[PDB]
Write a protein that binds this DNA or RNA. Structure first.
Lengths: 101, 202, 31, 203, 105, 8
RNA sequence: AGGUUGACCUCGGAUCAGGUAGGAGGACCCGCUGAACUUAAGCAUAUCAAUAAGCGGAGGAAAAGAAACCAACAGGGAUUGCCCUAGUAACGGCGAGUGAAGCGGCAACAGCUCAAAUUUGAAAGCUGGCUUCGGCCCGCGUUGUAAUUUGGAGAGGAUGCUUU
RNA sequence: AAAGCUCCUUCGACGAGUCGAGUAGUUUGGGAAUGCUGCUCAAAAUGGGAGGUAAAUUUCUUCUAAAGCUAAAUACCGGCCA
């Protein structure tokens, strides 16, 4: 941790203390991907397949209309970040299909 | 176990397998009664995580409720006061269809206690729910410390008072600045804020 | 309709172990 | 500005029961002390510093000791609430000073603690022996273990040989400069990246 | 009744001061229970999987052929959850598994 | 193989 | 005997064995639904008011509650209530008006249970019936009842002392 | 037989028509930052929510929703006793 300057204003302001390093709390492990969860989600994806909007976005990404794919995924999902993440997920699916074929 | 797979599959509601199962089950539940008993949960992972156990004293009731808004019971659907600049086609009930489902299932089985409920299917006309109920008079229930809290008289008709999950959701019982008016009870908070306090030595 | 005394006094196994090995103690603090 | 446009007389609260409620609270405290004797009527609380820049000059009692504080004081987390120590798992120790102060507080409490055996005829090694079980005790941990110095001392004396030289240029100038760099931190970085890009282009 | 007799023999062994492993032999049984069988397939301990053809809800077993194919486990769909229940002394078994048998089998 | 946890 | 004999699943009957619900009360409490007089010159935003009336549901209290919190600090640390914050931030035709929260002091303090794991060298769990009170049966349950774990962690190892 | 403490290579499952988005009604001091409900769309894995002015990019800080229980301090024009 960066030592504070001991001043009331400015960059790195605040009273000087000897900051400690913390062992990470187990409640903050949420989001970390597990091996079993990987295996189960991959198997369920293989069994169930895709949604129709996912198929539409995959078709747009194969046709190369990336901006239209992002706009359509934003309209379907609601937010820009979720739309983006779904776009890299479907691009990875397309890349796996191409490297298999 | 298998329930992790059932969870991940139940997330994929737009897949072909889940879509076909939802279609055929919607047809069957539409041919059945509005309120009927399910012999076993059709979503065992959902029921188990909401608290259902395969023990004598746990029952499942399937119910369908008509969806959409709410209409005020006025003659000819029109009002007789100041103009409201709206119709009765756009009046929204403040509780959920899930809460209505639990309330009707509790009235059907007044001897039981509603534990929780979960969505199972929907169509244009109805939404379908499954309600978990516990028998407070069953000895297997009463001897189990994980569940015998519900045998106390303070939990009579929790769904009528909003003490289930959808009831807490509709009452807005969450911590935070977004729930300043409702976290301790909206009417109680209003009474506290509108109470004039006069001390002896004022 | 009230629960019986035995059923109200039943506890879980983990709770019984915890109460067996760490009960509320009798203590005093010197001044 | 008078807010009397509602039905205010329906929810007027008077406080004629203030002395009676004080009497009831005192009777409840007496009953609690008699039930808890010889233990103190309350739990040991840590010393924490109030948040925000307005109140960070003052310390007060917190909810409970952290798990790191209990571990560094050698008190197990299951034993701690049974011997009059309040435990708070939500609070963390971001600095050494509060951690060390609370650990010393716990060590002082453990040194002044008398622990009676669970069975009188079978004493254990962790229990206080009977010849040391008798002493003058306290029944208020909030009084015996209060915040002795909530604020820093407002007055100190030094000799003029050790007067500090001070910030070069002046304290006012130092504050103005710190505010200036705080406001201009992004502009300097942007111009530095632009100059680096220009130097890389025309090296 | 067999479990009661085995526990009586083990109780006599403890009373005479012997371990229960000295009087009891390692058992070989058909493995059952859906969660248990899925765990065995994931640990690749199952040698053969038999899956009932009439499980309602079907989602309890709809992933299981694909799981067996991924883990390289021989599986077969068989008629009768009641028929598997007759194996496992139950009314109904959704799935049964063989992990290991005796040397004569 | 896929394991839920380390076992004794 | 196989056009037979059964195992399940689902759905029914019974004045079957044993239970439970209804109504009253409703000052206080948890929700739903919901005005108008009034105050704005009048008056469809607004105000009265998220009130009165109506409906459903509890208890001696109810409710809330052990953070998907507050914060931005040298950080506090479940919930409830009092004082203060504060008639303040903020909202508002043509303005009448409305109006919280964090910190801080105090009262009172108390923490926890599941789902997601294979006991798999042994459903170890439970309702009911009959008891000679030792137990024995009809069953529930593997589409999962016990033990173990709940994020503050835990599971597996190592290690040597403590505890009932 | 259970239980606690100390250390660690490794593992460390964590709630879905739910969150979130749009729209409509209602509500709030939160008519730019509130909550609830209906319809449509509909997730993710260091992910998600929040950080009271809309958006993109790069960071940071806090918790860990969609399951559940729990006394006290608080209310009391009903009932009983004083």
């Amino acid at each position: 941790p960066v030592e504070r300057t001991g001043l009331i204003r400015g960059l790195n302001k605040g009273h000087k203390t000897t900051r400690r390093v913390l062992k990470e709390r187990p409640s903050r492990r949420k989001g970390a991907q597990s091996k079993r969860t990987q295996f189960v989600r991959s198997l369920i994806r293989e069994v169930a397949g895709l949604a129709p909007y996912e198929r539409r976005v995959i078709e747009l990404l194969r046709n190369g209309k990336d901006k239209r794919a992002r706009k359509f995924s934003k309209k379907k999902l609601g937010t820009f970040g979720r739309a983006k993440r779904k776009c890299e997920e479907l691009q990875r699916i397309i890349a796996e299909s191409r490297r298999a074929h | 176990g298998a329930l992790k797979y059932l969870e991940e599959l139940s997330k994929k509601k737009q897949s072909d397998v889940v879509r076909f199962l939802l279609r055929v089950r919607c047809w069957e539940y539409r041919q059945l009664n509005v309120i009927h008993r399910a012999s076993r949960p059709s979503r065992p992972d959902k029921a188990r995580r909401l608290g259902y156990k395969a023990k004598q004293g746990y029952v499942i009731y399937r119910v369908r409720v008509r969806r959409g808004g709410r209409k005020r019971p006025v003659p000819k659907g029109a009002t007789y006061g100041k103009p409201t600049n709206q119709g009765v086609n756009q009046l929204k009930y403040q509780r959920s269809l899930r809460a209505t489902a639990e309330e009707r299932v509790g009235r059907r089985c007044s001897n039981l206690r509603v534990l929780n409920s979960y969505w199972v299917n929907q169509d244009s006309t109805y939404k379908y729910y499954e309600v978990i109920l516990v028998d407070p008079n069953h000895k297997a229930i009463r001897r189990d410390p994980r569940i015998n809290w519900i045998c106390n008289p303070v939990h009579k008709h929790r769904e009528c008072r909003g003490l289930t999950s959808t009831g807490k959701k509709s009452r807005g019982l969450n911590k935070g600045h977004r729930f300043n008016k409702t976290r301790a009870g909206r009417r109680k908070t209003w009474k506290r804020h509108n109470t004039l306090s006069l001390w002896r030595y004022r | 309709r009230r629960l019986s005394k035995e059923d109200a006094s039943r506890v879980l196994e983990k709770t019984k172990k915890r109460l067996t090995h760490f009960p509320q103690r009798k203590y005093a603090v010197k001044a | 500005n008078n807010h009397f446009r509602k039905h205010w007389q329906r929810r007027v609260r008077c406080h004629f029961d203030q002395p009676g409620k004080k009497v009831t609270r005192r009777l409840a405290r007496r009953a609690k002390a008699a039930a808890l004797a010889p233990r103190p009527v309350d739990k040991l609380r840590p010393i924490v510093r109030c948040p925000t820049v307005k109140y960070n000059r003052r310390t007060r009692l917190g909810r409970g000791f952290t798990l790191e504080e209990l571990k560094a004081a050698g008190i197990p987390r299951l034993l701690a609430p049974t011997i009059g120590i309040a435990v708070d798992h939500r609070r963390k120790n971001l600095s050494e000073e509060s951690l060390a102060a609370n650990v010393q507080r716990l060590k002082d409490y453990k040194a002044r603690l008398i622990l009676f055996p669970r069975k009188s005829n079978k004493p254990k090694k962790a229990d206080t022996p009977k010849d040391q079980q008798t002493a003058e005790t306290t029944t208020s941990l909030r009084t015996s273990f209060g915040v002795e110095q909530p604020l820093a001392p407002g007055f100190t004396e030094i000799s003029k040989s050790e007067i500090p030289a001070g910030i070069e240029g002046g304290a006012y100038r130092a504050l103005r400069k710190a505010r200036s760099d705080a406001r201009l931190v992004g502009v300097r970085e942007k111009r530095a990246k632009e100059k680096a890009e220009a130097e890389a282009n025309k090296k | 009744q067999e479990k009661k007799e085995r526990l009586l023999r083990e109780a006599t062994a403890i009373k005479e001061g012997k371990k229960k492993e000295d009087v009891s032999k390692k058992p070989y049984t058909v493995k059952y229970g859906l969660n248990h069988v899925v765990g065995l397939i994931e640990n690749k301990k199952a040698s053969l999987v038999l899956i009932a053809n009439d499980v309602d809800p079907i989602e309890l077993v709809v992933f299981l052929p694909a799981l067996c194919r991924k883990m390289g486990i021989p599986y077969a769909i068989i008629k009768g959850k009641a028929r598997l229940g007759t194996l496992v002394h139950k009314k109904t078994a959704a799935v049964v598994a063989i992990t290991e048998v005796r040397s004569e089998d | 193989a896929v394991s839920v946890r380390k076992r004794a």
